[PDB]
Amino acid sequence: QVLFQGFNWESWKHNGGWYNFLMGKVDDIAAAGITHVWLPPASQSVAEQGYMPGRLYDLDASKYGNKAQLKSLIGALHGKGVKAIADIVINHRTAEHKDGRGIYCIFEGGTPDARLDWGPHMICRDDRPYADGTGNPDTGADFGAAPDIDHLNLRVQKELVEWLNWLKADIGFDGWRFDFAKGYSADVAKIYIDRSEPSFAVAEIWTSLAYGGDGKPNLNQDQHRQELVNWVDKVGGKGPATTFDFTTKGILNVAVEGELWRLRGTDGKAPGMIGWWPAKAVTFVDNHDTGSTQHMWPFPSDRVMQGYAYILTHPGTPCIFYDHFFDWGLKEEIDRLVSVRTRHGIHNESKLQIIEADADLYLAEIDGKVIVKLGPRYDVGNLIPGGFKVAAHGNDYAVWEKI
Amino acid sequence: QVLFQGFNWESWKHNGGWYNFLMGKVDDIAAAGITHVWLPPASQSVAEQGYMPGRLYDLDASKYGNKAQLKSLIGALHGKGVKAIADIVINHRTAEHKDGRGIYCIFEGGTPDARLDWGPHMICRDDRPYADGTGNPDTGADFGAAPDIDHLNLRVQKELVEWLNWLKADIGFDGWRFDFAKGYSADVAKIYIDRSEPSFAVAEIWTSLAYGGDGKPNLNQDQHRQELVNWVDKVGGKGPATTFDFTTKGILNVAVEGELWRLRGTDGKAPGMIGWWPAKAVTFVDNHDTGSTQHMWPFPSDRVMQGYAYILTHPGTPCIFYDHFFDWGLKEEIDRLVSVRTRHGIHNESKLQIIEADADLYLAEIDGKVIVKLGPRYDVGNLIPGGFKVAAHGNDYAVWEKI
Numbered sequence: 154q155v156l157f158q159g160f161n162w163e164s165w166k167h168n169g170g171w172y173n174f175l176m177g178k179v180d181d182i183a184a185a186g187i188t189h190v191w192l193p194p195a196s197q198s199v200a201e202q203g204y205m206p207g208r209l210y211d212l213d214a215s216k217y218g219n220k221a222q223l224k225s226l227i228g229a230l231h232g233k234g235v236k237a238i239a240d241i242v243i244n245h246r247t248a249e250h251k252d253g254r255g256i257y258c259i260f261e262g263g264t265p266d267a268r269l270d271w272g273p274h275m276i277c278r279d280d281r282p283y284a285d286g287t288g289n290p291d292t293g294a295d296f297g298a299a300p301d302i303d304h305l306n307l308r309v310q311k312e313l314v315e316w317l318n319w320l321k322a323d324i325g326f327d328g329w330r331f332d333f334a335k336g337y338s339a340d341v342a343k344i345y346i347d348r349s350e351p352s353f354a355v356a357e358i359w360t361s362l363a364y365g366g367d368g369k370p371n372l373n374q375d376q377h378r379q380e381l382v383n384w385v386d387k388v389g390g391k392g393p394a395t396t397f398d399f400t401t402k403g404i405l406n407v408a409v410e411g412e413l414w415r416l417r418g419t420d421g422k423a424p425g426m427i428g429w430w431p432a433k434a435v436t437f438v439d440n441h442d443t444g445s446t447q448h449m450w451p452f453p454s455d456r457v458m459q460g461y462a463y464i465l466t467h468p469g470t471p472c473i474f475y476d477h478f479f480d481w482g483l484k485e486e487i488d489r490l491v492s493v494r495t496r497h498g499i500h501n502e503s504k505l506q507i508i509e510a511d512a513d514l515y516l517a518e519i520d521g522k523v524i525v526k527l528g529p530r531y532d533v534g535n536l537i538p539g540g541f542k543v544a545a546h547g548n549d550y551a552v553w554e555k556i
Numbered sequence: 557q558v559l560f561q562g563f564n565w566e567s568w569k570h571n572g573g574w575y576n577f578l579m580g581k582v583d584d585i586a587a588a589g590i591t592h593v594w595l596p597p598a599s600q601s602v603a604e605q606g607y608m609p610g611r612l613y614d615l616d617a618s619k620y621g622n623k624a625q626l627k628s629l630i631g632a633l634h635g636k637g638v639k640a641i642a643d644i645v646i647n648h649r650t651a652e653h654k655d656g657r658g659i660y661c662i663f664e665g666g667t668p669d670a671r672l673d674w675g676p677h678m679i680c681r682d683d684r685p686y687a688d689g690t691g692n693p694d695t696g697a698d699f700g701a702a703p704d705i706d707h708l709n710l711r712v713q714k715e716l717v718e719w720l721n722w723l724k725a726d727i728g729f730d731g732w733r734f735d736f737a738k739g740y741s742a743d744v745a746k747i748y749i750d751r752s753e754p755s756f757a758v759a760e761i762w763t764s765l766a767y768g769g770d771g772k773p774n775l776n777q778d779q780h781r782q783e784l785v786n787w788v789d790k791v792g793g794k795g796p797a798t799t800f801d802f803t804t805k806g807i808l809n810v811a812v813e814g815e816l817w818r819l820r821g822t823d824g825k826a827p828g829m830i831g832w833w834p835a836k837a838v839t840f841v842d843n844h845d846t847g848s849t850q851h852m853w854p855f856p857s858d859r860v861m862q863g864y865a866y867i868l869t870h871p872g873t874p875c876i877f878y879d880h881f882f883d884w885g886l887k888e889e890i891d892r893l894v895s896v897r898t899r900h901g902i903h904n905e906s907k908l909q910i911i912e913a914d915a916d917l918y919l920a921e922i923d924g925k926v927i928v929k930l931g932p933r934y935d936v937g938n939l940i941p942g943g944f945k946v947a948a949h950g951n952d953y954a955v956w957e958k959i
């Protein structure tokens with residue numbers, strides 16, 4: 154399962170429309186061995202990138218393109234074997250109309266009927282000024298800038314599950330990435346996952362790493378991955394549910410700048426979520442927030458390939474980011490890695506054994522068939538077994554594969 | 557067994573004589589809980605510090621003092637419970653007289669008889685110009701500046717074992733530290749150890765650490781401690797034989813400057829010799845060469861107490877260096893640590909479990925009774941068990957002891 158993020162922060166701006174643009178990259182994407190692409194928020198949003206949704210059923214006001222273009226793109230991805238997963242922003246919603254108080258708290262689903270046309274009662278009890286105090290309190294965090302939907306209200310749960318099934322059925326989406334899933338409880342999410350039955354769903358739980366007395370992250374980030382592992386438990390370990398592994402991303406970010414010892418945790422296992430539940434963890438080097446033009450937590454640029462050498466050979470389900478693959482010129486090195494991975498049947502639950510993790514060398518062996526070396530360390534051969542030949546290499550990475 | 561090094565590079569210079577001087581520190585030394593003190597080379601040496609011996613039986617030409625003063629000092633140490641171990645420099649010897657060739661290759665033992673009065677035949681075949689080609693080749697490394705004794709010659713072995721037994725019997729020495737034990741084979745050393753039967757013997761095998769592609773030592777220094785562990789095997793694992801743990805000293809030197817992750821080796825065990833054979837390893841922060849006025853491999857000065865917090869709580873047999881204890885003002889902090897160690901019966905073979913080793917924190921638990929934290933990391937309490945109270949602390953160290 155290797156995922157691709159088919160957009161970045163600037164994508165809405167594209168001349169002629171991003172979904173149209175993306176039509177052209179479907180073959181390349183299919184060819185890299187990508188199995189799912191995560192498409193940006195489809196509905197009408199106040200914010201052009203999509204994360205501030207209003208008329209949920211109105212896919213036509215999207216700045217990425219209209220419903221007709223979405224279905225053609227999802228048609229193309231599907232015709233080529235790949236699945237399309239959708240950014241479900243349902244923690245918060247923006248309102249169409251002012252109520253009596255002059256507050257924008259009357260929602261409009263986008264259709265002549267009443268689906269999704271809620272008012273203040275479906276806003277979480279306490280999210281003043283939008284709330285009118287009569288809904289249930291928030292199951293999770295608040296998003297400041299907008300109304301937070303009260304996911305314990307039953308009309309909310311039904312109309313939002315109808316909308317999810319419509320996105321699967323009429324639009325074609327296969328799975329969900331749940332935006333700001335800290336916004337609501339794993340229980341609420343579970344209803345949506347269970348009742349829409351996606352073939353894949355990844356939640357975005359993003360919290361800070363623990364930082365030590367030195368301004369740098371701690372080697373141990375067990376509080377941080379526990380929280381990911383916990384969401385997956387409550388939601389259901391047997392489900393399709395996964396969380397992005399922000400722990401590996403946070404560590405790697407630092408590790409790569411000459412601190413590769415950071416990659417062998419306290420227990421001698423990988424320090425990120427993939428060290429405890431690789432199966433339910435999807436890994437990434439960067440996304441539209443951490444990277445792109447937002448630069449919230451970027452991977453060191455001169456090192457993104459050591460990042461892909463790591464996520465692509467290791468357990469967990471890797472996510473390639475649009476920009477790296479298509480705009481940085483790393484296409485081919487990334488391809489080669491996705492091949493090594495697919496060729497040896499490396500998969501989300503592969504076994505990892507960390508041979509060495511010193512400041513200047515990380516050497517790990519996955520599934521007995523592939524070894525990856527990250528780092529500038531030159532004197533290395535003595536540790537890579539007889540029987541392996543180098544499969545890929547580039548800047549401060551090399552991966553050998555057996556015979 | 558905690559050893560003390562009762563001298564440094566400048567000691568020969570002391571006004572009024574070092575052994576005399578040292579008479580005054582015997583009580584303090586005895587009181588710290590020190591069980592052995594390593595005294596500098598006793599015989600006549602061309603080089604004032606002792607490491608260039610000539611008339612082996614002539615203890616009177618020592619710049620540290622004469623035979624009478626040595627015996628009084630060893631008498632005092634013994635009267636107070638401590639043993640005295642001697643620096644046996646027998647790899648090389650300097651000659652008293654020129655032979656026919658005009659080469660200084662006629663030795664003089666220091667007595668009217670012939671004990672130790674060898675000539676070129678007892679010099680290793682190849683150490684030109686001193687050698688006359690008729691002796692056996694060197695069993696080990698060469699010391700450039702002087703004649704290397706051919707320890708395979710049987711007269712050499714007998715007279716040098718007589719001299720060793722005289723140092724035990726007439727002078728009072730209890731054990732040996734074998735200077736430059738790379739100078740000769742572990743086999744030759746074994747004869748001297750076995751036949752003089754010391755109660756303690758430590759060899760000085762000093763080689764370089766492996767350095768990586770970054771100018772810093774590798775985390776793994778297994779080639780380096782293998783060599784120590786090997787000498788002890790050939791010499792005899794059941795003997796009194798030990799080697800100084802240069803591996804821990806080399807690592808620690810670096811580790812302490814914010815790289816405390818260096819202290820959990822590749823295998824999750826201590827990286828120095830004490831991780832493989834703690835019993836046969838004697839640890840140190842610095843000695844007359846690495847430190848003192850020679851500064852060959854000094855411990856970072858503002859950090860020597862993190863070094864003693866480590867060696868004093870950990871397995872292996874610790875060696876306190878004269879200067880730290882008596883001249884740096886660390887006496888009391890060092891004492892306190894030697895107490896924690898002795899109080900809880902921590903000993904050369906105690907069990908070590910490394911809780912965490914991150915750049916800014918090293919936390920280890922010895923024998924279930926003591927925990928030591930090295931590093932500036934502040935947020936620590938969550939990892940030290942309920943039941944432990946802090947026993948000592950100071951600059952970037954603290955050690956707790958159970959109840």
Ligand SMILES: C=C1O[C@H](O[C@H]2[C@H](O)[C@@H](O)[C@H](O)O[C@@H]2CO)[C@H](O)[C@@H](O)[C@@H]1N[C@H]1C=C(C=O)C(=O)[C@H](O)[C@H]1O
Nearest residue numbers: 204205242332333334335357358359360361441442449
């Ligand atoms: C951009 C996002 O911000 C939040 O993550 C923050 C973490 O909580 C914080 O602890 C860490 O140190 O830094 C973060 C960013 O600075 C949200 O939790 C995260 O979910 C959010 N990501 C998405 C949500 C949006 C609003 O609906 C967006 O505009 C993003 O584009 C989404 O991917």
Ligand SMILES: C=C1O[C@H](O[C@H]2[C@H](O)[C@@H](O)[C@H](O)O[C@@H]2CO)[C@H](O)[C@@H](O)[C@@H]1N[C@H]1C=C(C=O)C(=O)[C@H](O)[C@H]1O
Nearest residue numbers: 607608645735736737738760761762763764844845852
């Ligand atoms: C001072 C000593 O030098 C040697 O150690 C060197 C190591 O071999 C080298 O690899 C390392 O990088 O650095 C070293 C010092 O720069 C000898 O091997 C060592 O045994 C020697 N130590 C003693 C021997 C002497 C000569 O008889 C001395 O003058 C010292 O005072 C002794 O302790």
Ligand SMILES: C[C@H]1O[C@@H](O)[C@H](O)[C@@H](O)[C@@H]1N[C@H]1C=C(CO)C(O)[C@H](O)[C@H]1O
Nearest residue numbers: 378379382383386390428429430431432
């Ligand atoms: C393997 C694990 O290490 C533990 O110390 C964590 O506290 C735990 O949460 C994590 N457990 C998870 C991982 C797996 C699979 O390895 C599960 O099935 C568990 O339910 C899930 O909580």
Ligand SMILES: C[C@H]1O[C@@H](O)[C@H](O)[C@@H](O)[C@@H]1N[C@H]1C=C(CO)C(O)[C@H](O)[C@H]1O
Nearest residue numbers: 781782785786789793831832833834835
């Ligand atoms: C425990 C050890 O780890 C091994 O990987 C080393 O290669 C080995 O040399 C070392 N072995 C030594 C240590 C002990 C005690 O632990 C012995 O009795 C052995 O003879 C001695 O070689």
Ligand SMILES: [Ca+2]
Nearest residue numbers: 264265266270
């Ligand atoms: Ca409507």
Ligand SMILES: [Ca+2]
Nearest residue numbers: 280296299301
């Ligand atoms: Ca809100």
Ligand SMILES: [Ca+2]
Nearest residue numbers: 293294301336
């Ligand atoms: Ca919320």
Ligand SMILES: [Ca+2]
Nearest residue numbers: 667668669673
């Ligand atoms: Ca004589």
Ligand SMILES: [Ca+2]
Nearest residue numbers: 683699702704
């Ligand atoms: Ca010589």
Ligand SMILES: [Ca+2]
Nearest residue numbers: 696697704739
């Ligand atoms: Ca020699």
